[PDB]
Design a binder for this molecule. Structure first.
Ligand SMILES: Cc1[nH+]cc(COP(=O)(O)O)c(CN[C@@H](CCC(=O)O)C(=O)O)c1O
Ligand SMILES: Cc1[nH+]cc(COP(=O)(O)O)c(CN[C@@H](CCC(=O)O)C(=O)O)c1O
Lengths: 387, 387
């Protein structure tokens, strides 16, 4: 197995920091390395494995559709596509009844941005500092982290950033020339920072007052992650365009930009498109993913386990912890120092896999099927590494 | 089945011209609609089904990996990724040994543009008129078609376009401020127009002389579509970055940008990324697709049937036919009048699905395993619809 690891390290572009281990299988919230070591996975492909590694229903839907049909364009209707369309819009506010399927989050946001420009006829985009929307140049233009943008300038203009949760800043920034505002209900990479009701209420109200669109990026908060089907169900606002991805396909690359009908209608024929977007394989996985989510009301586990996990985390007596925050099973532990060293030790010393969300924050995005025995061990592991 | 069709038509964003039918299954170069009618598929998901609908090896690879592991990020090595990396680089010239896996053709070019700027420190992109590179804003900036770019400007700048196959024009445009040239060995959407040896050689030489990077877009011409493994093999040149997608995963959403070592090396850690890019499921499918392509040397069927197929089309006694062109099984039939109605007749009266490549061109992108007897049927169908 060491030849595959070394081949991956060698042939990779090098843009990633690859860990010294090879993960070969996964079931539920557990994964195994090539040596047989079993880990608690709080990474879950960056919030993709919400339904759990090896989810039976999704795996089955994938196997069956793979035998039937995988390549069929948007110009040629295919049953699983219509089924995904009606299954996803049925668990959403009736205003969001138009779907543009894609293959990633960045493509979902790229779709939202384009649909927003064609509909308003405006150009400006307003986003929040510490926000992440994707790496493709369109989505990168509204992604804050200067490190990620500077090297590739100039990007798409004009874009304006405002502090997250700053009601007045958002109010001043949104004008008659703003095509749309794009925000995460809970900032992910930005450090697991929940939006305030006042902030999202202001975003909704002012975008309407100015004729601008509101794009809510729930690529990471979606599919039960925050304790509710979708984070927005926590605040009581309905955006003009909703973008989803990650867990939407239960593992299969899948994304979607759901929008109001008058928004979709403004897009000229052939104004946008995608080869893989809407393909039967992803569509089938999507139907399965959503059907599992709804039958099991999976967001509940995050709603019950989230607070429970965060409480135990808080109880950890270490002066290195500044704050424990999050919503449901989207948790962040902010330290008063670099988190990277502790993430490496959780993996090798405790077989616990975690993420970062800024250099001093440890982020947890475990599958929502994860049990309490596993969450408790993660806690103990964190406590042990911090001591 | 009608319920599912109306649901797709109604809930779709509406940016597509959806045909009046519902395709439920496929096998080889044939597909069936929900009524049981069988069609000869020359669309193939827009050149995705190169290996044929239902390819045993790919379908099987998908089933096995789906039960094993589907969600695992780039920071955590996984066997199928290392396998894909070496399997893909092994079928390419030595120089192309660094891989950045993605989820679509547009993401592949988006990565190519970003790596180019990072490596050269330059900003300018040079593309060809009638060229197509994708719908995300980055790739859209280098895509000609005004009706597609215009409504979304301003986009990524600066971008200069030159006439396809114009040697002197390309030379005058590529200078010490050019980050990269991006070209298709054979323009797809632009009407199936092959590059000439002089033009591509010119591109390779002038980019080297000026310190600019050469990006060859084989998202459409790749995987044995033009008669050889990759279209550049017919021209005797090695690009600096090769972008692929479409048939690369045998149906599963997959794309990639393969580049020379010094190019990848210039990219800052974390300078680019993607959630789904490089996931085990797409990697496993990618491995199976390549092994199949190599075992059968599938491009040979394209090289043999292509020329034969084109001669047959040119011999059709119809004054409406202007010219036939293409390479392997990437064929374009140019008519002296709108093609749309003949594509509708082909579908309804002969159950032959075909594409367009401009308003006056009928484009054919059938699985490479299509039977010679079926292409004859296609030629016959064309001769009848043009009567
Ligand atoms: C809110 C959000 N929006 C858009 C994206 C982009 O979508 P996609 O094209 O499918 O990556 C991501 C990835 N953020 C995760 C991964 C980023 C990375 O690759 O690093 C994460 O923050 O862990 C997001 O967290
Ligand atoms: C050369 C080429 N490059 C990049 C892309 C972008 O890849 P993707 O992001 O996966 O679509 C395509 C799709 N072009 C076909 C489909 C466009 C459409 O949606 O229609 C086409 O040639 O019509 C290409 O033909």
């Amino acid at each position: 197995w060491r030849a595959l690891l070394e081949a991956e390290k060698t042939l990779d572009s090098g843009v990633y920091n690859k860990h010294d281990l090879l993960i070969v299988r996964g079931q539920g919230a557990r994964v195994w390395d090539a040596e047989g070591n079993e880990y608690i996975d709080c990474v879950g492909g960056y919030g993709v494995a919400n339904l759990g590694h090896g989810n039976p229903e999704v795996v089955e839907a994938v196997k069956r559709q793979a035998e039937t049909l995988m390549a069929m364009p948007q110009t040629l209707p295919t049953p699983m596509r219509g089924e995904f369309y009606r299954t996803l819009t049925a668990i959403l506010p009736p205003e969001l009844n138009r779907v543009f399927p894609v293959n990633s989050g960045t493509e979902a946001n790229e779709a939202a941005l384009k649909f927003a420009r064609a509909h308003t006829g405006r150009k400006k985009f307003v986003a929040a500092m510490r926000g992440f929307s994707g790496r493709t140049m369109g989505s990168l233009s509204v992604t804050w982290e200067p490190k990620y943008r500077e090297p590739f300038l100039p990007l798409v203009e004009p874009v304006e950033f405002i502090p997250y949760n700053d009601v007045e800043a958002l109010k001043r920034a949104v004008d008659e020339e703003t095509a749309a505002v794009i925000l995460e209900p809970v900032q992910g990479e930005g450090g697991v920072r929940p939006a305030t009701p006042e902030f999202l209420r202001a975003a909704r109200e002012i975008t309407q007052e100015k004729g601008a669109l509101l794009i809510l990026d729930e690529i990471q908060t979606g599919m039960g992650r925050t304790g509710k089907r979708f984070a927005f169900e926590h605040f009581g606002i309905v955006p003009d365009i909703l973008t989803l991805a990650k867990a939407l396909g239960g593992g299969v690359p899948l994304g979607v930009a759901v929008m109001r009908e008058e928004v979709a209608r403004s897009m000229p024929k052939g104004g946008h498109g995608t080869t893989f977007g809407g393909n039967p394989l992803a569509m089938a996985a999507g139907v399965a993913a959503i059907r599992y989510l709804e039958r099991t009301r999976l967001w509940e586990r995050a709603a019950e386990l989230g607070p429970w996990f965060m409480e135990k985390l808080r109880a950890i007596p270490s002066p290195k912890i500044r704050e424990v925050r999050g919503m449901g099973l989207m948790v962040g532990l902010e330290l008063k120092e670099k988190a990277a060293p502790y993430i490496a030790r959780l993996e090798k010393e405790h077989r616990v896999l975690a993420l970062q969300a800024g250099p001093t924050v440890i982020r947890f995005l475990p599958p929502l099927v994860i049990e309490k025995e596993d969450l408790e061990r993660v806690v103990e592991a964190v406590r042990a590494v911090l001591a």
